[PDB]
Ligand binder design. Sequence first.
Ligand SMILES: CC(C)COc1cccc(-c2nc3cc(C(N)=[NH2+])ccc3[nH]2)c1[O-]
Ligand SMILES: [Ca+2]
Ligand SMILES: [Cl-]
Length: 223
Amino acid sequence: IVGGYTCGANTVPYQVSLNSGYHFCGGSLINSQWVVSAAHCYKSGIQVRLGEDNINVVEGNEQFISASKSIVHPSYNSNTLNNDIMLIKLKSAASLNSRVASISLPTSCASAGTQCLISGWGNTKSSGTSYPDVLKCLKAPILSDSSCKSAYPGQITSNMFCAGYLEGGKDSCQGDSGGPVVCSGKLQGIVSWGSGCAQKNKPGVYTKVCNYVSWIKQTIASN
Ligand SMILES: CC(C)COc1cccc(-c2nc3cc(C(N)=[NH2+])ccc3[nH]2)c1[O-]
Ligand SMILES: [Ca+2]
Ligand SMILES: [Cl-]
């Protein structure tokens, strides 16, 4: 997260770290056995780490559970990143409490101007790599479709939305991919891509979760 702030330990109880011997992507807990992340964060050998704050220290509250299966969206396109969503089922269910809790799926899509919270352990510099030990947070508004398409002409599908600041300085970045964009207590986006990090006129692009609620529900129900 570039231009963000320290969230505070466990203030984002649905945030998870996908780990394969190091932190590589973020994700969101939606029920005690399922997490949602981005399809391009897929790999085998994934351990889901819940209740984390400092990812390099066991401070307490952590639950490390292996993934039993990852379900990448059948229409995911690695070249355009269209349908960049993946569901991970956990080997055992997580114990939910106040430090580990799930976030709700939306019933409607959010509108431009809606303010949302993006969190993650991704890079904090737009030029160079500086990864943090604790969770970083950023409040960012959803932008209008016209400003998003003007910024990335030909690359935005109806399953993506832009959120951020056109002046630059605040944005999600590498290491944040797969994590949550929460607005009014509902999971509305998944960190997906962007051009560099916090560059002027190049806001972040997120997977539009409201277009996948029936797919998420039907898939969890049959697995
Ligand atoms: C499969 C992963 C281990 C590799 O993931 C990645 C490798 C290189 C860059 C990214 C990445 N750049 C990103 C930029 C942004 C942004 N809003 N500017 C957001 C997420 C990003 N994720 C990324 O997610
Ligand atoms: Ca820790
Ligand atoms: Cl266009």
